[PDB]
Amino acid sequence: ICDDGWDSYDAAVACKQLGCPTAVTAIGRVNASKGFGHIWLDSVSCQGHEPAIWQCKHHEWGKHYCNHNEDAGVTCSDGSDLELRLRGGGSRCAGTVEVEIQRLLGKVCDRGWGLKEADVVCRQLGCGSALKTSYQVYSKIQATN
Amino acid sequence: ADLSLRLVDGVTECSGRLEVRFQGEWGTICDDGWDSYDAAVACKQLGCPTAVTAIGRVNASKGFGHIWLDSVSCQGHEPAIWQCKHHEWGKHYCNHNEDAGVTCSDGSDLELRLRGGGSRCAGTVEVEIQRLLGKVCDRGWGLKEADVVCRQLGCGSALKTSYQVYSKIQATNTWLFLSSCNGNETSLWDCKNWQWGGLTCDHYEEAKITCSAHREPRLVGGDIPCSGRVEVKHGDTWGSICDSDFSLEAASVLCRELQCGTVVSILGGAHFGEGNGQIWAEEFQCEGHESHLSLCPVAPRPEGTCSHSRDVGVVCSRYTEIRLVNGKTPCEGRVELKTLGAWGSLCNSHWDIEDAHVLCQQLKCGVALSTPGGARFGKGNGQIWRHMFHCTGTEQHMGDCPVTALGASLCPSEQVASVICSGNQSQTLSSCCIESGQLRLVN
Amino acid sequence: VLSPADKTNVKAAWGKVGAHAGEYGAEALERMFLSFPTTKTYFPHFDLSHGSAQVKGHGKKVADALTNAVAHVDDMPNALSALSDLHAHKLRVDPVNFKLLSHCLLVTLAAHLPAEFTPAVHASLDKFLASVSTVLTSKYR
Amino acid sequence: VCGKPKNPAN
Amino acid sequence: ILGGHLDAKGSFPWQAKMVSHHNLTTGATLINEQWLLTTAKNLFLNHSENATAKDIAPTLTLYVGKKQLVEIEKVVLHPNYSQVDIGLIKLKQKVSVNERVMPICLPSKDYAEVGRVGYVSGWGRNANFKFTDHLKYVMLPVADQDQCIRHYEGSTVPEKKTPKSPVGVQPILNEHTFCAGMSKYQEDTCYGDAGSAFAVHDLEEDTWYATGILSFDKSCAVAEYGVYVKVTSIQDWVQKTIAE
Amino acid sequence: VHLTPEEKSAVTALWGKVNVDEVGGEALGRLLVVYPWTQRFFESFGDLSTPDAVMGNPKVKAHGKKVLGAFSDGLAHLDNLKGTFATLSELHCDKLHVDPENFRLLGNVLVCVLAHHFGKEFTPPVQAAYQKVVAGVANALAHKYH
Ligand code: HEM
Ligand code: HEM
Ligand SMILES: *[C@@H]1O[C@H](CO)[C@@H](O)[C@H](O)[C@H]1NC(C)=O
Ligand SMILES: *[C@@H]1O[C@H](CO)[C@@H](O)[C@H](O)[C@H]1NC(C)=O
Ligand SMILES: *[C@@H]1O[C@H](CO)[C@@H](O)[C@H](O)[C@H]1NC(C)=O
Ligand SMILES: *[C@@H]1O[C@H](CO)[C@@H](O)[C@H](O)[C@H]1NC(C)=O
Ligand SMILES: *[C@@H]1O[C@H](CO)[C@@H](O)[C@H](O)[C@H]1NC(C)=O
Ligand SMILES: [Ca+2]
Ligand SMILES: [Ca+2]
């Protein structure tokens, strides 16, 4: 399936059909190879109450412009396996944002990263407010994909 | 329909503005899309040589009345101009400033020269075509056209299209326009679609070339090519320079132009021996950043007779005499250096792969492949030179590397430097391997 | 198609421009070279810099042409015939460019004259510059 | 044949 | 076409897009299994009146359906080309008929009277004067022939004829032509739309006839009536030609 | 497309002051007025014939609002343009079959309405940047046509 329009309602309905918890649903590909062959569904747009993915609106089957780098994927979790921490800023309240999801470590990209996202991160970790997003050099831990 | 072709206001009966008689009345042809095949058909019909065919109106006035043909497009085999493709007869948007003309030539009556740049190889490009003088317009004038001009005149390459002030010869009403040449042409006349006259040149006149052969320095009579008496070719004549007329800035320019590095010394008093023939009575008032002496202002010598006993000499910074001996190829062998006039083997005590790389590059042998230890190519029968070279491997010549020979330890007779180069000039050092750390001492 | 209403509107709006018609004509040109660099390939030898005198005068020319057209607007193509042939054949200007300059002229005139641009006028102004840019283009082949 | 586009305009 | 009605289904399978040597996109319609009509004008772009068919035929590129490239053998011009503006292109082979590609029938009856409405497709320019990226189409009524005559020139009676044409050039107006009005929303047909057929759908017998081919595509915004050359008037001529 | 930092900075700083309850609806109803054939798509609203009806009708500005928002979302993240309008593109192209050129016309009338409100302070470089923006938008929105 192509990632075009793929949202949290689609992921939640698919996992629900699989019977897993749907409290938190992320998109994207962890350790997953590139697919091959057909992309069957594109621009899936569900309302979230639907019982199966193939009753939402979609383009004609097998007609797409996507390539297999845009294949949609999901991870559905109950929230117990999501950790957030800052590493490498000399304290627990400054540094690179490291996340651990399904035991996979990763980092937040700065594209779209503003003071609003940072203050939310600081508050969730109980570090008060984000003042400023800067350099503080360090021996940082590397790397992720 | 009654068709006839004639030329009017030509230099000859087979050059001029093209006129067609139609149904008893005469009219002209527009130049729109008009190319060399149309001109070639016209030239063939007049029975003139078609080896070189120019477009444009030479000394030809503007026509009057009808313009009968427009957008003529021939394949060149056609027997007459009016059987080619054209728009409807008498239907046009052209004015009589866009009237087509031809010059049919065997090539013998076209001369091109540069005037007013102090030599035959620099100045404004003046052309004489069918005894009409004109100038090249700078619109569309690039290094490709200038290099074609310099090559056709045997003036070498175009170095720069510049100002060099002068008493220039004035004036013309005739301009040459080049739309573009590729630059691989043998003659400016071989550049395509050049226009001679007939279009209203703007206020940016007088393009002027300086070719590489305008002033050529050399050093003569020194022990190394970058040391000797200075002789300069101006025009086709070599002349000496007086020791009074050649500054340190000019010597800096000379060592840079000759690709000899930095000026090491200026020596007056015919230090390299007296010259012969002409002494230039001109001082080069260089600022010292100019790429060539051709760009330096020149001042006339104040009243004074110089003699060749006062010829200026320059020494620049390089040792050039290195060779490979006893290789199976010219790109492998024992390294021999000439010092004190004698060839001798270099010691391998400090002979690394960077030094061998610099020699291999200098010798056009590509990259160094190995520095075999031991007298693999023999020890040689001469003295062993104990010079310790310190190349980085990026130098173009061994003389640019720092050299220390004072106090160097005794080299055993079997510990001679040797090299194996790649033998292929197409192999250059690529950036990676160079270890990720360099150390230097500054000041 | 320029109804009486449109024509009246265009006249009334283009009058209030008056002697400023020239400098806008030039400001518009500046935008195209900055906005759509491909139009520069029609003006090789022109100085294209900011407020260039050459730009300013060419703009005064295009301005005056336009004022002429609107002065007697009910037969424009006879008046503009020589420019028809000038741009169509000699200069061979690709018809998208007139619609470019048309739009630059509407944004620029909009910016400088806020009070008169009620929609009806934006309409008949776009129609007017359409009709002209056509008549210049209409001898293409 | 006349008059039978697979999908007409209407 | 500057305005709307995007062609979603491909309801006009006989429309071919032919591009001349200098990248000028132009309409042609597929009139039978081996042949397509077009205009003499369209044929003559980037060529002199001197040029003959052998010269013109290799220059053109032609496209059917989506990108489908059909090759082209010979070319034939209407003997009255300067008056009746019509060419014929013969395709090197047959085209596979299917839902998107199929020729149109030449009409027996004549629907030239005012009150009828028709459908004109086109590949021509739009309101940005860009060649359209996708084929479009528009419906147009047919217009009173006299109103159109008095519109483009001044006369009726031929001695009072003067070039009243809103654009620079004068259209061909004779007894072999008819005029189509302006749209309901003032849409019209512009550069590139020549050679497309004015196709009237006959509801009782449910068939789409090409009554005319668009000659004058210059009118665009500025000129209230497009004008077509009736195909019925070249009826007996095209049949004679098909035999060769 | 790629954009140098001071265009995006002048764009966002300008976009802050843009009144979001009016401008979008004025651009839309102006497109409707100048090129009346688009009324064909919106005529469920009511009388679109005169400009006063158009200007008054609450559904014209009601729609314009949603369109202006959608454009704000476009201008927010300009590097991933395809995905943001992918659904709107399905709505307009596959079900409605709007011809994509009237998108740019609307983007232009938008910049026009922008210039109308912002006078001399809306300068040729900032305009040229918004032109780049409404282009990239028009393209991403038109990408599924090929
Ligand atoms: C509303 C449409 C246009 C009008 C009213 C207009 C008006 C004019 C005028 C008055 C002149 C000077 C005529 C003369 O000096 O004899 C001119 C020349 C010229 N036009 Fe335009 N023009 C239009 C469209 C365009 C466009 C869109 C372009 C290209 C983007 C263009 C390119 C030129 C050029 C290159 C010249 C010659 C300039 C020179 O060499 O002095 N024209 N036009
Ligand atoms: C190019 C920029 C455009 C944007 C950002 C845009 C955005 C939108 C938005 C946000 C909606 C409402 C969707 C919803 O209710 O969830 C919409 C609906 C619609 N769009 Fe656009 N649009 C654009 C261009 C156009 C144009 C120019 C037209 C037609 C001339 C058009 C045709 C329509 C129609 C007819 C609807 C109503 C659909 C319905 O309610 O049934 N779109 N558009
Ligand atoms: C992700 O990496 C590999 C490759 O798929 C997989 O075997 C591994 O289990 C995954 N990571 C973790 C932390 O389990
Ligand atoms: C050029 O033509 C004029 C007459 O038009 C003539 O007097 C003159 O000699 C010609 N020039 C040359 C160099 O022959
Ligand atoms: C089109 O016509 C022009 C005008 O005669 C001609 O010069 C040109 O070769 C033709 N072809 C193209 C591709 O422009
Ligand atoms: C225009 O024609 C030329 C010459 O055949 C060709 O190189 C070019 O790709 C064409 N351009 C387009 C947009 O089709
Ligand atoms: C072309 O028109 C002339 C003049 O009326 C006529 O004699 C001739 O028959 C016409 N051509 C055809 C094929 O009818
Ligand atoms: Ca979705
Ligand atoms: Ca020619």
Coordinates of N, CA and C in Angstrom, one line a residue, chain A residues 2-5 42-45 57-60 65-66 70 111, chain F residues 77-80 82-84 86-88 90 94 143-146:
Chain A
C2 N 0.5 2.2 -0.8 CA 1.2 3.5 -0.8 C 0.9 4.4 0.4
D3 N 1.8 5.2 0.8 CA 1.7 6.0 2.0 C 0.9 7.3 1.8
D4 N 0.4 7.5 0.6 CA -0.3 8.7 0.2 C -1.7 8.8 1.0
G5 N -1.8 9.8 1.9 CA -3.0 9.9 2.7 C -3.1 9.0 3.9
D42 N -4.2 3.2 -2.7 CA -3.6 4.5 -2.6 C -4.7 5.5 -2.2
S43 N -4.2 6.5 -1.4 CA -5.1 7.6 -0.9 C -6.3 7.0 -0.1
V44 N -6.0 6.0 0.8 CA -7.0 5.5 1.7 C -7.4 6.6 2.7
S45 N -8.7 6.8 2.8 CA -9.3 7.8 3.7 C -10.5 7.2 4.4
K57 N -12.7 4.8 0.8 CA -12.5 5.3 -0.6 C -11.0 5.1 -0.9
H58 N -10.8 4.8 -2.2 CA -9.4 4.6 -2.8 C -9.6 4.7 -4.3
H59 N -8.4 4.9 -4.9 CA -8.3 4.9 -6.4 C -8.5 3.4 -6.9
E60 N -8.7 3.3 -8.2 CA -8.7 2.0 -8.8 C -7.6 1.1 -8.4
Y65 N 0.7 6.1 -9.0 CA 2.0 6.7 -9.4 C 3.1 6.4 -8.4
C66 N 2.8 5.8 -7.2 CA 3.8 5.6 -6.2 C 4.9 4.6 -6.5
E70 N 7.5 4.6 -0.9 CA 6.4 5.2 -0.3 C 5.3 4.2 0.2
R111 N 13.4 19.2 10.9 CA 12.4 19.7 10.0 C 11.0 19.8 10.6
Chain F
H77 N 4.3 23.6 5.4 CA 5.4 22.7 5.0 C 5.4 22.5 3.5
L78 N 6.4 23.2 2.9 CA 6.5 23.4 1.4 C 7.5 22.3 0.8
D79 N 8.2 21.6 1.7 CA 9.1 20.5 1.2 C 8.3 19.2 0.9
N80 N 7.4 18.9 1.7 CA 6.4 17.8 1.3 C 5.1 18.4 1.0
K82 N 3.3 17.2 -2.1 CA 2.5 16.1 -2.7 C 1.5 15.6 -1.6
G83 N 2.0 15.2 -0.5 CA 1.1 14.5 0.5 C 0.0 15.4 1.1
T84 N 0.4 16.6 1.4 CA -0.6 17.5 2.1 C -1.8 17.8 1.2
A86 N -2.7 15.8 -1.3 CA -3.1 14.5 -2.0 C -4.6 14.2 -2.0
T87 N -5.2 14.4 -0.8 CA -6.7 14.2 -0.7 C -7.4 15.3 -1.4
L88 N -7.1 16.6 -1.2 CA -7.8 17.6 -1.9 C -7.7 17.3 -3.4
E90 N -7.5 14.5 -4.8 CA -8.5 13.4 -5.2 C -9.9 14.0 -5.3
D94 N -10.4 13.8 -9.4 CA -11.1 12.5 -9.7 C -12.6 12.6 -9.7
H143 N -0.4 17.0 -9.6 CA 0.6 15.9 -9.9 C -0.1 14.6 -10.4
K144 N -1.3 14.3 -9.8 CA -1.9 13.1 -10.2 C -2.5 13.1 -11.6
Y145 N -2.5 14.3 -12.3 CA -3.0 14.3 -13.7 C -2.0 13.6 -14.7
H146 N -0.8 13.4 -14.3 CA 0.2 12.6 -15.0 C 0.9 11.6 -14.1

